[PDB]
């Protein structure tokens, strides 16, 4: 038993300019029929990995919520998307959860996908730290799994030149002092390259985020009463007698 709804709309993703890594966009799907293949069909995928969930399950099971985080990303920097990364990008721009089931998709954009536009260049932040009230002591400021860079409000939509240094003072609420940052650029390739993070949440609500499936009239509770059956009710599976 599943409710009917609408198909998950990924048009937003495909209808504008790709976000920067440290300023990505988040699409959350709830009560929805998804099709991961349909989406990936539009991209010349380079890689696809998962953790604590199979590549199959991510495209076939039911979830309480499905989160898609998308942004522009140089293909060549994949080495720092590992959980156990060096840090230059991971610890400041974008991190993913290691406690929830997650996947990572790396793909390039074909010439035919003309609805998605091309950025001037790639940007990222390499440095981000806080200065204390003594204007001498500094402490690194890192980004968490579901957060945005701690100094995202300081850094502009693009890094014009490597070494561009940004600064603002802090109000007493945060303990005063200064918050500072510095980034760099990467030359844009002939074709747009893009990355997608996926987080899967289970058990917090009705698992109504499912694939789209048809059905027969012999899969109802009614008229099956008293018999041992297998079941799947809004993502909740098991075996028993109704």
């Amino acid at each position: 038993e599943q409710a009917e709804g609408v198909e998950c709309d990924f048009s937003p993703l495909l209808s504008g300019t790709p976000p920067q890594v440290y300023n990505f966009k988040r699409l959350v799907f709830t009560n929805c029929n998804y099709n991961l293949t349909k989406l990936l069909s539009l991209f010349s995928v380079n890689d696809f990995t998962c953790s604590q969930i199979s590549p199959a399950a991510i495209a076939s099971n039911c979830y309480s919520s499905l989160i898609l985080d998308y942004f522009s990303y140089p293909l060549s920097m994949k080495s720092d998307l590992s959980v156990s990364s060096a840090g230059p990008i991971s610890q400041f721009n974008y991190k993913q959860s290691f406690s929830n089931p997650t996947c990572l998709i790396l793909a390039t954009v074909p010439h035919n996908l003309t609805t998605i536009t091309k950025p001037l260049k790639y940007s990222y932040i390499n440095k981000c730290s806080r200065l204390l009230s003594d204007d001498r002591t500094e402490v690194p400021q890192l980004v968490n799994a579901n957060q945005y860079s701690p100094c995202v409000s300081i850094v502009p939509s693009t890094v014009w030149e490597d070494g561009d240094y940004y600064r603002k003072q802090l109000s007493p609420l945060e303990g005063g002092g200064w918050l500072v940052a510095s980034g760099s650029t990467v030359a844009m390739t002939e074709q747009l390259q893009m990355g997608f993070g996926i987080t899967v949440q289970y058990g917090t609500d009705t698992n109504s985020v499912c694939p789209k499936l048809e059905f027969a009239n012999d899969t109802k509770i009614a008229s099956q009463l008293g018999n041992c059956v297998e079941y799947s009710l809004y993502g909740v599976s098991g075996r028993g007698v109704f």
Partner: antibody
Framework: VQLLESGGGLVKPGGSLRLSCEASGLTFSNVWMSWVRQAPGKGLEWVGR??????????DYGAPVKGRFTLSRDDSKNTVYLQMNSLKIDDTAVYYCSTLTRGGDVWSSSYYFDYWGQGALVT | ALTQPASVSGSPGQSITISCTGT?????????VSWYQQHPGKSPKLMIYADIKRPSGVSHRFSGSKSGNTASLTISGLQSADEADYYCCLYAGSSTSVIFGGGTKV
């Protein structure tokens, strides 16, 4: 501001040539320097640019001379150099010593070339 | 890449424009296109920068205009003394090259 440029001449393809120029009226150590070229019948084409000494004096080049031309500068003389390690016949052009600046701020920047020198002919 | 008209012309006193087209990354998103004027035998000079303003050495006849992904140079009350090769130039910051159009015969 005056940008005095010299060092042109005729060198057969396969050979090499170095251009140089001297800046006066500006603070050399506080400006970016660059080069462009223009062949007869063609429009303007970027050769490359060099940063300030305080910035490590790094360089960036146009694709047409990638891996062939090198830029350098020396603040003790207020001069800029462009060395053409390997010349091609297509390099026949007038070269121009120039400067590069930015407007706006760090949040939103805008780049442009303000000053240009007399130029020199490479053929 | 920047695309310009082969040539633009008119009589002294008339208003003419020189177009310079590109895409969202060239003109649309940022006000970073400049215009140059070159007389035969001479170096180019800067007429307008950042799609907005001119150097104090440039007359009021020359003004910028932008619409969508099209940039242009407007010459209001053109003079015979304005005859020159005009160039549209695009340049951002790091990790990118300087882009020039083919030039316009004005």
């Amino acid at each position: 501001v005056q940008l005095l440029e010299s060092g042109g001449g005729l060198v057969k393809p396969g050979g090499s040539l170095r251009l140089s120029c001297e800046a006066s009226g500006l603070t050399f150590s506080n400006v970016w320097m660059s080069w462009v070229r223009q062949a007869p019948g063609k429009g303007l084409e970027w050769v490359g640019r060099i940063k300030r000494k305080s910035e490590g004096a790094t360089t960036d080049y146009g694709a047409p001379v990638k891996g062939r031309f090198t830029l350098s500068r020396d603040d003790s003389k207020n001069t800029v150099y462009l060395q053409m390690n390997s010349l091609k016949i297509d390099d026949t052009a007038v070269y121009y010593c120039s400067t590069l600046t930015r407007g706006g701020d760090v949040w939103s920047s805008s780049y442009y070339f303000d000053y240009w020198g007399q130029g020199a002919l490479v053929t | 890449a920047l695309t310009q008209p082969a040539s633009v012309s008119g009589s002294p006193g008339q208003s003419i424009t020189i177009s310079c087209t590109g895409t969202s990354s060239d003109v649309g998103t940022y006000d970073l296109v400049s215009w140059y004027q070159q007389h035969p035998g001479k170096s180019p000079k800067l007429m307008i920068y950042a799609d907005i303003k001119r150097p104090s050495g440039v007359s009021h006849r020359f003004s910028g205009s932008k619409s969508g992904n099209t940039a242009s140079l407007t010459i209001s009350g053109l003079q015979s003394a304005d005859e020159a090769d005009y160039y549209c130039c695009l340049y951002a910051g790091s990790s990118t090259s300087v882009i020039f159009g083919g030039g316009t015969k004005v």
